[PDB]
Tab-separated table of C-alpha atoms and ligand atoms in Angstrom:
chain	number	residue	atom	x	y	z
A	1	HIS	CA	135.656	83.468	116.599
A	2	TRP	CA	131.982	84.190	116.279
A	3	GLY	CA	129.479	83.276	118.929
A	4	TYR	CA	126.506	84.863	120.540
A	5	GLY	CA	128.035	86.743	123.478
A	6	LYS	CA	128.592	90.491	123.927
A	7	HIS	CA	132.000	90.428	122.296
A	8	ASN	CA	131.581	88.018	119.388
A	9	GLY	CA	127.805	88.086	118.847
A	10	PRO	CA	125.547	88.869	115.795
A	11	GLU	CA	126.264	92.571	115.785
A	12	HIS	CA	130.011	91.889	115.341
A	13	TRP	CA	129.761	89.312	112.550
A	14	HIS	CA	129.974	91.820	109.695
A	15	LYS	CA	133.654	92.536	110.462
A	16	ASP	CA	134.637	88.987	109.460
A	17	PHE	CA	131.704	88.086	107.173
A	18	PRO	CA	130.917	91.367	105.318
A	19	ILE	CA	127.890	89.729	103.679
A	20	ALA	CA	126.158	90.059	107.107
A	21	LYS	CA	125.047	93.511	105.827
A	22	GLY	CA	123.847	92.157	102.455
A	23	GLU	CA	120.652	92.031	100.503
A	24	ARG	CA	118.936	88.684	101.303
A	25	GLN	CA	119.866	88.040	104.911
A	26	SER	CA	117.892	85.907	107.310
A	27	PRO	CA	115.976	85.662	109.708
A	28	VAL	CA	113.244	88.297	109.014
A	29	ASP	CA	110.011	89.191	110.720
A	30	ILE	CA	107.035	87.742	108.860
A	31	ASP	CA	104.383	90.452	108.643
A	32	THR	CA	101.285	88.320	108.001
A	33	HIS	CA	99.253	91.258	106.664
A	34	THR	CA	101.797	92.019	103.927
A	35	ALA	CA	102.783	88.465	102.947
A	36	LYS	CA	101.169	87.799	99.568
A	37	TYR	CA	98.964	84.790	99.035
A	38	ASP	CA	100.352	83.114	95.927
A	39	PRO	CA	97.915	80.583	94.460
A	40	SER	CA	100.554	79.190	92.058
A	41	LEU	CA	102.634	77.765	94.940
A	42	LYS	CA	102.428	73.959	94.938
A	43	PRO	CA	101.940	71.978	98.244
A	44	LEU	CA	105.133	70.835	100.016
A	45	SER	CA	106.220	67.270	99.496
A	46	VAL	CA	108.259	65.950	102.393
A	47	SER	CA	109.306	62.288	101.764
A	48	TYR	CA	111.117	61.336	104.985
A	49	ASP	CA	110.197	57.626	105.382
A	50	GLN	CA	113.639	56.471	104.100
A	51	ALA	CA	115.641	58.799	106.386
A	52	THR	CA	118.867	57.468	107.934
A	53	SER	CA	120.115	59.467	110.949
A	54	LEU	CA	123.729	58.780	111.824
A	55	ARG	CA	125.136	61.151	114.443
A	56	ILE	CA	124.312	63.959	116.821
A	57	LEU	CA	127.144	66.412	117.533
A	58	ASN	CA	127.650	69.570	119.625
A	59	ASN	CA	129.490	72.027	117.367
A	60	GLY	CA	129.940	74.986	119.721
A	61	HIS	CA	126.873	76.862	118.655
A	62	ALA	CA	124.092	74.253	118.583
A	63	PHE	CA	123.788	70.465	118.189
A	64	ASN	CA	123.254	68.909	114.726
A	65	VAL	CA	121.610	65.557	113.903
A	66	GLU	CA	123.328	64.407	110.696
A	67	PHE	CA	121.782	62.238	108.021
A	68	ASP	CA	123.119	59.997	105.290
A	69	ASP	CA	122.689	62.086	102.081
A	70	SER	CA	124.487	59.852	99.523
A	71	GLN	CA	121.197	58.852	97.878
A	72	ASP	CA	117.721	60.366	97.790
A	73	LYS	CA	116.594	59.009	101.151
A	74	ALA	CA	114.835	61.955	102.871
A	75	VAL	CA	113.978	64.645	100.321
A	76	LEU	CA	111.938	67.797	100.000
A	77	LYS	CA	110.326	68.985	96.800
A	78	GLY	CA	107.234	70.871	95.713
A	79	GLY	CA	106.383	74.195	97.278
A	80	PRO	CA	108.499	76.977	95.726
A	81	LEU	CA	111.293	74.473	94.833
A	82	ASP	CA	112.435	73.300	91.442
A	83	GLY	CA	113.875	69.808	91.817
A	84	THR	CA	114.879	67.591	94.677
A	85	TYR	CA	116.512	68.893	97.819
A	86	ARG	CA	118.150	66.211	100.046
A	87	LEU	CA	118.088	66.385	103.935
A	88	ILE	CA	121.616	66.501	105.341
A	89	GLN	CA	121.036	67.711	108.984
A	90	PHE	CA	118.753	69.512	111.438
A	91	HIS	CA	119.515	71.783	114.441
A	92	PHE	CA	117.600	74.148	116.726
A	93	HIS	CA	117.996	77.745	117.977
A	94	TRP	CA	116.550	78.414	121.484
A	95	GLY	CA	116.477	80.985	124.267
A	96	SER	CA	117.219	81.320	127.978
A	97	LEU	CA	113.543	82.055	128.668
A	98	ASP	CA	110.394	80.751	126.883
A	99	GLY	CA	109.513	84.019	125.094
A	100	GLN	CA	112.622	84.201	122.956
A	101	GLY	CA	114.607	81.702	120.958
A	102	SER	CA	113.148	81.617	117.467
A	103	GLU	CA	115.035	83.438	114.721
A	104	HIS	CA	112.104	84.211	112.398
A	105	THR	CA	109.295	86.072	114.166
A	106	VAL	CA	105.573	86.276	113.136
A	107	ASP	CA	104.141	89.776	113.610
A	108	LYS	CA	107.064	90.386	115.865
A	109	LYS	CA	106.089	87.468	118.156
A	110	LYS	CA	109.018	85.331	119.212
A	111	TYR	CA	108.691	81.634	119.981
A	112	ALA	CA	110.716	79.488	122.407
A	113	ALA	CA	112.782	77.785	119.702
A	114	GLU	CA	113.077	77.119	115.987
A	115	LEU	CA	113.984	73.908	114.201
A	116	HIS	CA	115.868	74.086	110.918
A	117	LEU	CA	115.863	71.085	108.580
A	118	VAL	CA	118.661	71.789	106.144
A	119	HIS	CA	118.432	70.417	102.569
A	120	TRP	CA	120.635	70.865	99.439
A	121	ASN	CA	119.761	70.911	95.751
A	122	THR	CA	120.834	67.618	94.187
A	123	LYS	CA	121.579	69.115	90.719
A	124	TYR	CA	124.816	70.529	92.154
A	125	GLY	CA	126.034	67.065	93.222
A	126	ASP	CA	127.364	67.792	96.737
A	127	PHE	CA	126.686	70.257	99.581
A	128	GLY	CA	129.918	72.138	98.907
A	129	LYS	CA	128.802	73.036	95.374
A	130	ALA	CA	125.218	73.835	96.486
A	131	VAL	CA	126.407	76.684	98.761
A	132	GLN	CA	127.949	78.337	95.640
A	133	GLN	CA	124.425	78.685	94.131
A	134	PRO	CA	121.430	81.104	94.831
A	135	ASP	CA	118.914	78.255	94.946
A	136	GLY	CA	121.314	75.720	96.408
A	137	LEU	CA	119.658	75.146	99.780
A	138	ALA	CA	116.174	74.997	101.191
A	139	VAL	CA	115.760	75.162	104.966
A	140	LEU	CA	112.409	74.099	106.415
A	141	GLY	CA	111.844	76.208	109.611
A	142	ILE	CA	109.379	75.005	112.282
A	143	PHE	CA	108.548	77.061	115.405
A	144	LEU	CA	108.402	75.510	118.872
A	145	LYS	CA	106.136	76.778	121.640
A	146	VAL	CA	105.978	75.457	125.240
A	147	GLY	CA	102.941	73.333	126.101
A	148	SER	CA	102.416	69.620	125.794
A	149	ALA	CA	105.338	67.246	125.394
A	150	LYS	CA	106.212	66.285	121.820
A	151	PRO	CA	106.834	62.459	122.080
A	152	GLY	CA	108.947	62.405	118.897
A	153	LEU	CA	111.446	64.901	120.384
A	154	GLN	CA	112.239	62.802	123.503
A	155	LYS	CA	114.900	60.549	121.899
A	156	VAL	CA	116.902	63.714	121.020
A	157	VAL	CA	116.349	65.166	124.515
A	158	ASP	CA	117.630	61.984	126.126
A	159	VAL	CA	120.975	61.796	124.206
A	160	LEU	CA	121.984	65.413	125.132
A	161	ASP	CA	123.957	64.475	128.326
A	162	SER	CA	126.221	62.553	125.989
A	163	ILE	CA	127.202	65.660	123.977
A	164	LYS	CA	127.254	68.350	126.654
A	165	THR	CA	130.396	70.192	125.548
A	166	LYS	CA	131.800	71.355	122.206
A	167	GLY	CA	133.214	68.625	119.950
A	168	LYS	CA	131.418	65.662	121.527
A	169	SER	CA	129.239	63.354	119.435
A	170	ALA	CA	127.229	60.159	119.856
A	171	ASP	CA	125.819	57.626	117.342
A	172	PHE	CA	122.220	58.530	116.732
A	173	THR	CA	120.693	56.106	114.302
A	174	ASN	CA	117.060	55.344	113.389
A	175	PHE	CA	115.676	58.720	114.376
A	176	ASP	CA	112.649	59.477	112.223
A	177	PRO	CA	112.213	63.254	111.461
A	178	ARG	CA	108.477	62.818	110.728
A	179	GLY	CA	107.839	62.985	114.497
A	180	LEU	CA	108.764	66.726	114.442
A	181	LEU	CA	106.303	67.855	111.759
A	182	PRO	CA	103.095	69.807	112.691
A	183	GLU	CA	99.794	68.701	111.246
A	184	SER	CA	99.659	71.385	108.542
A	185	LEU	CA	102.198	71.939	105.833
A	186	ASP	CA	101.058	75.558	105.186
A	187	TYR	CA	104.011	77.818	104.770
A	188	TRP	CA	105.458	81.218	104.088
A	189	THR	CA	108.555	81.363	101.837
A	190	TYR	CA	111.094	83.983	100.864
A	191	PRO	CA	114.685	84.053	99.445
A	192	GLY	CA	117.253	84.267	102.279
A	193	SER	CA	120.620	83.122	103.700
A	194	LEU	CA	122.196	80.908	106.419
A	195	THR	CA	121.606	82.589	109.800
A	196	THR	CA	125.038	81.820	111.230
A	197	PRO	CA	128.482	82.450	109.580
A	198	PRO	CA	129.295	82.164	106.772
A	199	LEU	CA	125.802	83.778	106.117
A	200	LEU	CA	125.835	82.691	102.455
A	201	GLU	CA	122.843	83.885	100.506
A	202	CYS	CA	121.864	80.564	99.009
A	203	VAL	CA	118.695	79.641	100.893
A	204	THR	CA	115.015	79.331	99.990
A	205	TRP	CA	113.330	79.643	103.345
A	206	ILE	CA	110.159	77.690	103.902
A	207	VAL	CA	108.753	78.607	107.294
A	208	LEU	CA	105.734	76.630	108.509
A	209	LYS	CA	102.709	78.417	109.807
A	210	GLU	CA	101.903	75.892	112.567
A	211	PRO	CA	104.205	75.538	115.641
A	212	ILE	CA	104.821	72.159	117.221
A	213	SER	CA	104.588	72.257	120.997
A	214	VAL	CA	107.237	70.837	123.362
A	215	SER	CA	107.127	70.697	127.201
A	216	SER	CA	108.925	73.101	129.466
A	217	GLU	CA	111.198	70.249	130.673
A	218	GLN	CA	111.984	69.256	127.084
A	219	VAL	CA	113.141	72.901	126.431
A	220	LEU	CA	114.998	73.043	129.794
A	221	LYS	CA	117.361	70.301	128.747
A	222	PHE	CA	118.441	72.269	125.634
A	223	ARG	CA	119.624	75.000	128.019
A	224	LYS	CA	121.970	72.638	129.919
A	225	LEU	CA	124.312	72.303	126.918
A	226	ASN	CA	127.586	74.115	126.662
A	227	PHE	CA	129.162	76.407	124.103
A	228	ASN	CA	132.518	75.664	125.706
A	229	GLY	CA	134.637	72.627	125.102
A	230	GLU	CA	135.422	70.250	127.953
A	231	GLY	CA	137.352	71.603	130.915
A	232	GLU	CA	136.880	75.336	130.135
A	233	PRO	CA	134.694	77.984	131.999
A	234	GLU	CA	131.093	76.794	131.696
A	235	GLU	CA	129.068	78.786	129.248
A	236	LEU	CA	125.448	77.689	128.889
A	237	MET	CA	124.176	77.328	125.358
A	238	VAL	CA	121.238	79.626	125.472
A	239	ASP	CA	120.220	82.369	123.059
A	240	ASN	CA	121.962	81.040	120.008
A	241	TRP	CA	119.756	83.068	117.615
A	242	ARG	CA	120.216	85.956	115.218
A	243	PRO	CA	117.916	89.047	115.469
A	244	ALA	CA	115.591	89.740	112.516
A	245	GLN	CA	117.214	91.388	109.522
A	246	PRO	CA	115.788	93.953	106.960
A	247	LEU	CA	113.540	92.522	104.348
A	248	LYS	CA	115.108	94.992	101.802
A	249	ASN	CA	112.581	94.646	98.898
A	250	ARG	CA	112.054	90.871	99.087
A	251	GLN	CA	108.411	89.743	99.259
A	252	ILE	CA	107.228	86.926	101.531
A	253	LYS	CA	104.715	84.690	99.705
A	254	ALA	CA	102.142	82.582	101.669
A	255	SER	CA	100.661	79.280	100.460
A	256	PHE	CA	97.401	79.997	102.341
B	1	PTS	C1	127.698	74.172	106.963
B	1	PTS	C2	126.698	74.900	107.858
B	1	PTS	C3	127.016	76.382	108.043
B	1	PTS	C4	126.070	77.086	109.064
B	1	PTS	N1	126.477	76.641	110.427
B	1	PTS	C5	124.618	76.778	108.797
B	1	PTS	C6	123.522	77.480	109.394
B	1	PTS	C7	122.280	76.940	108.995
B	1	PTS	S1	120.762	77.731	109.282
B	1	PTS	N2	120.756	78.332	110.908
B	1	PTS	O1	120.659	78.892	108.451
B	1	PTS	O2	119.671	76.806	109.231
B	1	PTS	S2	122.465	75.673	107.892
B	1	PTS	C8	124.156	75.709	107.992
B	1	PTS	S3	125.148	74.773	107.004
B	1	PTS	O3	125.316	75.412	105.731
B	1	PTS	O4	124.759	73.384	107.036
B	2	MMC	C1	125.257	82.483	95.743
B	2	MMC	HG1	124.912	81.154	97.296
B	3	ZN	ZN1	119.618	77.296	111.959
């Protein structure tokens, strides 16, 4: 099955998921001098004060923090979105070295990691139906660069010994996502897809201009996780990111 190594990595995914060669694949490089300022784009509205985190889980390719999405508790609206998108989970993509890790790049510059806050369009009723639609999901992408510690990330960093290998989980309640937002909600946005299998082209990408910073020792702990399940050859979970894909006639709009 798919992974990120030499034999099962991004360049092989097309054989099992033929849409990997499609029209609106993600990530992409954001060329800032060709992104079009669009004055009709509304400001983002992130209402995350009611968020209920439930679990953190290592799934073999990253770790997800899962949220209760049975009611409009943490939602995203505004920006390029029509209607309410509900937060279901967030995960990161990171590298083995600080100058790689992000999926989206900005003028070909790579960051140390990228956070994806995954939301689904409530008019389709459940997540399963939303991935059958072109505007079914919105992922909010935030870049991470190494510098000062981000206080709000430390509770996640501390539970990671508890989920070191594939399949493990831990209860992870009362985590507030607002502690991972940068100061500015300025964004670029373009129509894309999931960046891991099944690579469904259902996503409205909203990538924030401003990186949050995290310390070197906060990023180092991400690299101690394992792709492998318990009691197998140790395989450090580093470099779980997809290279930039062709823009193919999409336009990236900027809110600034
Ligand atoms: C069911 C999951 C299937 C994939 N593992 C996936 C990848 C996501 S990304 N890297 O594009 O933000 S969101 C997501 S999901 O649809 O939640
Ligand atoms: C069509 Hg998703
Ligand atoms: Zn992701």
